[PDB]
């Protein structure tokens, strides 16, 4: 069934599961033509496929060539997503395949379900949560492997860096969702919180700074302030 606040701890049990977000698969800039009409130019996108218990991110880069000569691209994007997720599952050993796939948008249910007909024991589920996964693409290093791609490519990351050595996956997911909510609502003022201090740096092999435990509390506190504010600046309260 649908995933919501009530069954949130299920994300961190020992049944393998993947979130799939398709927001950033088909991406365009809209511009004027010489004749004064409007046209779109596509840019590279990505499927965001995340194991919330381990932090294992399978980032399938979608190169603009996959749209050449195709119609109804927003619709095709959902089926392309489902085809790539299906290909990913088939590439994994049986004992690594997910028992559930949770899609962040309901329009992905039927495309994924049809592509996964071969896997009747994999549950395809929606969610009621408003998860902020589009916001990975605002992390410069992520903006860059996607934008630099010249061909289809799968890039493998742990989105939690080394956090699981010190915190649980519940706490790591909550940190991730807070950072991404923050990186959604106001990219610039949330970009200052993470690296406006020049002594905390990211390891070459990571997406987030090496904050200490105490610095993470400060950082997390600053992100919640941002989110509350912008919610005022937005609604005037």
């Amino acid at each position: 069934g649908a995933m919501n606040s009530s069954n949130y701890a299920e994300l961190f049990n020992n049944d393998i599961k993947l979130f799939v977000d398709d927001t950033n698969v088909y991406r365009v800039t809209v511009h004027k033509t010489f004749e004064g009409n409007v046209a779109t130019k596509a840019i590279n996108g990505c499927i965001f496929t995340l194991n919330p218990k381990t932090g294992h991110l399978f980032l399938k880069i979608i190169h603009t060539s996959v749209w050449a000569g195709q119609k109804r691209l927003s619709q095709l994007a959902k089926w392309k997503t489902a085809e790539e997720v299906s290909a990913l599952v088939r590439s994994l050993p049986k004992e690594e395949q997910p028992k559930q796939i949770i899609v962040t948008r309901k329009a992905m249910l039927d495309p994924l379900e049809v592509h996964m007909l071969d896997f009747p024991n994999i549950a395809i589920r929606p969610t009621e949560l408003r998860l902020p996964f589009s916001a990975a693409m605002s992390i410069d290093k992520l903006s860059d492997v996607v934008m630099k791609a010249t061909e289809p490519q799968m890039v493998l990351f742990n989105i939690y860096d080394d956090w699981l050595d010190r915190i649980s996956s519940y706490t790591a997911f909550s940190r991730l969702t807070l950072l991404l909510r923050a990186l959604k609502t106001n990219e610039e003022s949330a970009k200052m919180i993470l690296l406006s201090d020049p002594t905390i740096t990211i390891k070459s092999y990571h997406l987030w700074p090496s904050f200490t435990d105490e610095q993470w509390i400060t950082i997390e506190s600053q992100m919640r302030d941002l989110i509350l504010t912008e919610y005022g600046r937005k609604y005037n309260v």
């Binding site: 095709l76 089926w79 489902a82 039927d110 495309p111 379900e113 049809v114 592509h115 007909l117 071969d118």
Partner: protein, 300 residues
């Protein structure tokens, strides 16, 4: 013109014969129905006055035998039976006609309704959907479930309609997932028409039979089947032109005949709005769209 005599009418019952119906009182001197047109299947159906629960009835074709009705007080229903003794039957009927104890199948001469509702329905195909091979006629009632319903429980008492499922390996060619799901022509023309039904007449016959069981018995699984068979054609970009023209005629007469007060349960809003306004064939059902818009504009 043939006759279905009744031994008696011991319980008050509304009797249907095709799209006609009449009331019979407890122990009324009623001995059957005469002047039944040859050349068509027919259905004779029952709703007891005391228990509107369970509409039930029998599909039959008088060319296949001499059939009569007899109330069974143990099982509590009117049962169809075959009389194998031809001269016994003729003598029974002639006596009942002489005493004018039979109602006349009341067909208006201009009226093609029943032909139009049963054009492609054959008894031999009914008997494969309703399996009871010791009889030449077929029992159906409001509660019988379909094979597909059982998969989602008594196999002997099921309606064995052709299983249609748009999200199934039969419907979806590996590697044509998006193509086959958004344009069901493969599934309609290759899997179902060429593979399973053999021709469109058998397809239309099952569609018509499913509608009639939905209308006369309120059989929910039959209504599901009728809508699924409509949707499979409407959701196909490539349909033979003769099939579309015949479908429009079929549906038109079904909508024409439907009780105005049953449209709330017998018509699926989603299927009809999709078929008439969003599907590949949205512009191919002129007669059906005009009668639906003038008779059930609320649904749409």
């Amino acid at each position: 013109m043939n006759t279905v005599p009744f031994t008696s009418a011991p319980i008050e019952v509304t009797i249907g014969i095709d799209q006609y119906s009449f009331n019979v009182k407890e122990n009324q001197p009623f001995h059957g129905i005469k002047d039944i047109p040859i050349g068509h299947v027919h259905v004779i159906h029952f709703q007891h006055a005391d228990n509107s629960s369970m509409r039930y009835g029998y599909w039959f074709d008088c060319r296949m035998g001499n059939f009569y009705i007899q109330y069974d007080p143990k099982d509590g229903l009117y049962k169809m039976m075959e009389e194998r003794d031809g001269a016994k039957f003729e003598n029974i009927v002639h006596n009942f006609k002489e005493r004018q104890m039979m109602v006349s199948y009341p067909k208006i001469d201009e009226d093609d309704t029943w032909y139009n509702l049963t054009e492609f329905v054959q008894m031999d195909k009914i008997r494969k959907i309703v399996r009871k091979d010791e009889n030449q006629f077929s029992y159906v009632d409001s509660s019988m479930t379909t094979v597909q319903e059982n998969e989602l429980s008594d196999p002997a008492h099921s309606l064995n309609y052709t299983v249609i499922n748009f999200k199934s390996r039969e419907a979806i060619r590996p590697g044509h997932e998006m193509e086959d799901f958004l344009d069901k022509s493969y599934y309609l023309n290759t899997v179902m028409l060429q593979g399973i039904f053999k021709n469109s007449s058998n397809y239309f016959g099952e569609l018509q039979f499913a509608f009639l069981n939905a209308m006369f018995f309120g059989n929910y699984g039959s209504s599901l089947q009728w809508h699924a068979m409509i949707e499979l054609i409407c959701s196909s970009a490539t349909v033979p032109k003769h099939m579309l023209d015949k479908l429009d005629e079929i549906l038109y007469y079904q909508i024409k005949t439907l009780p105005e007060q049953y449209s709330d349960i017998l018509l699926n809003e989603r299927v009809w709005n999709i078929c008439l306004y969003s599907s590949f064939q949205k512009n191919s059902l002129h007669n059906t769209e005009k009668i639906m818009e003038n008779k059930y504009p609320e649904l749409l």
